[PDB]
Design a protein around this motif. Structure first.
Motif, PDB file in Angstrom:
ATOM      1  N   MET B  55      -1.640  12.216   2.141  1.00 23.39           N
ATOM      2  CA  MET B  55      -2.755  11.693   1.361  1.00 23.39           C
ATOM      3  C   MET B  55      -2.542  10.144   1.804  1.00 23.39           C
ATOM      4  N   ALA B  56      -2.982   9.449   0.533  1.00 22.94           N
ATOM      5  CA  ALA B  56      -3.033   7.541   0.546  1.00 22.94           C
ATOM      6  C   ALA B  56      -3.042   7.431  -1.126  1.00 22.94           C
ATOM      7  N   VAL B  57      -2.738   6.443  -1.104  1.00 22.99           N
ATOM      8  CA  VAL B  57      -1.839   5.798  -2.114  1.00 22.99           C
ATOM      9  C   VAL B  57      -3.021   4.711  -2.413  1.00 22.99           C
ATOM     10  N   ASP B  58      -4.336   4.112  -2.861  1.00 21.37           N
ATOM     11  CA  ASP B  58      -4.953   2.794  -3.437  1.00 21.37           C
ATOM     12  C   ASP B  58      -3.758   2.118  -4.065  1.00 21.37           C
ATOM     13  N   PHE B  59      -3.462   0.636  -4.369  1.00 20.13           N
ATOM     14  CA  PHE B  59      -2.696  -0.095  -4.611  1.00 20.13           C
ATOM     15  C   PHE B  59      -4.156  -0.778  -5.477  1.00 20.13           C
ATOM     16  N   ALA B  60      -3.820  -1.611  -6.720  1.00 21.41           N
ATOM     17  CA  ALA B  60      -4.937  -3.015  -7.556  1.00 21.41           C
ATOM     18  C   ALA B  60      -4.665  -4.085  -7.170  1.00 21.41           C
ATOM     19  N   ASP B  61      -3.818  -3.876  -6.351  1.00 19.19           N
ATOM     20  CA  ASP B  61      -4.212  -5.407  -5.737  1.00 19.19           C
ATOM     21  C   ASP B  61      -4.349  -5.090  -3.892  1.00 19.19           C
ATOM     22  N   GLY B  62      -5.149  -4.144  -3.830  1.00 21.43           N
ATOM     23  CA  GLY B  62      -6.245  -3.950  -2.623  1.00 21.43           C
ATOM     24  C   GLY B  62      -5.030  -3.164  -1.472  1.00 21.43           C
ATOM     25  N   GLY B  63      -4.180  -3.490  -1.554  1.00 18.68           N
ATOM     26  CA  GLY B  63      -3.682  -1.774  -0.582  1.00 18.68           C
ATOM     27  C   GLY B  63      -3.507  -1.129  -0.908  1.00 18.68           C
ATOM     28  N   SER B  64      -3.394  -0.461   0.880  1.00 23.69           N
ATOM     29  CA  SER B  64      -3.695   0.887   0.944  1.00 23.69           C
ATOM     30  C   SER B  64      -2.616   1.852   1.268  1.00 23.69           C
ATOM     31  N   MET B  65      -2.361   2.992   0.846  1.00 20.68           N
ATOM     32  CA  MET B  65      -0.783   3.002   1.689  1.00 20.68           C
ATOM     33  C   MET B  65      -1.354   5.102   2.039  1.00 20.68           C
ATOM     34  N   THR B  66      -0.863   5.176   4.082  1.00 20.78           N
ATOM     35  CA  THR B  66      -1.146   6.452   4.298  1.00 20.78           C
ATOM     36  C   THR B  66       0.465   7.100   4.286  1.00 20.78           C
ATOM     37  N   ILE B  67       0.995   7.922   3.524  1.00 20.12           N
ATOM     38  CA  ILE B  67       1.789   8.535   2.808  1.00 20.12           C
ATOM     39  C   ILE B  67       1.354  10.158   4.037  1.00 20.12           C
ATOM     40  N   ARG B  68       1.877  10.719   4.901  1.00 20.71           N
ATOM     41  CA  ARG B  68       1.807  11.909   6.428  1.00 20.71           C
ATOM     42  C   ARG B  68       2.456  12.687   6.352  1.00 20.71           C
TER      43      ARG B  68
END
Lengths: 96, 97
Positions: B55-68
């Motif tokens: 899955m991933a998670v986008d944040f409000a500050d532009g960052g995005s994060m992959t959680i495999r």
């Protein structure tokens, strides 16, 4: 900053040697257990048995099995005894 | 008993943005399955563990994060984020109560 459990776990190469990892409100501990090291105390904790099985003995004789892929909580303040008959990789989630 | 077999709890849930919630002392567990997304959400901090799938998670500050599959991360309270999953993810959330 995601934490790759298999990653950090493969690296740490002694039993009873926690890698501590901080992330906002949460403290993570990654350890492998074998055997046992008697009794402890320490708020609530989440123990997640990533790789083998493991048990937590309680002072009043109670006992909890945490088999692989299982997850349990060890309440705050209760003397207890984590142990592993055959080796377990454990992630432990804490607060403050 | 007082333990949670993730796999078996998840297998019971065959719906998609429908968290099952379990209590154990000062912890709450949400088990939910994710596909595509449902936009932005924002409490207390949450640990996320990608039990099966990525899955991933986008944040409000532009960052995005992959959680495999196999990985944990934490979504702090009061950060708007957009949880989401390209081919589907089974996930545990954790919080204090």
């Amino acid at each position: 900053e995601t934490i790759n459990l298999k990653q950090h776990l493969a690296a740490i190469k002694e039993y009873w040697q926690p890698e501590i990892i901080n992330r906002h409100g949460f403290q993570f501990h990654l350890v492998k257990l074998l055997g046992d090291y008697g009794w402890h105390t320490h708020s609530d904790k989440v123990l997640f048995a990533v790789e083998g099985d493991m048990a937590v003995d309680f002072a009043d004789g109670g006992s909890m099995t945490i088999r692989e892929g299982e997850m349990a909580v060890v309440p705050k303040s209760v003397s207890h005894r984590p142990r592993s008959e055959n080796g377990c990789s454990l992630v432990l989630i804490e607060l403050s």
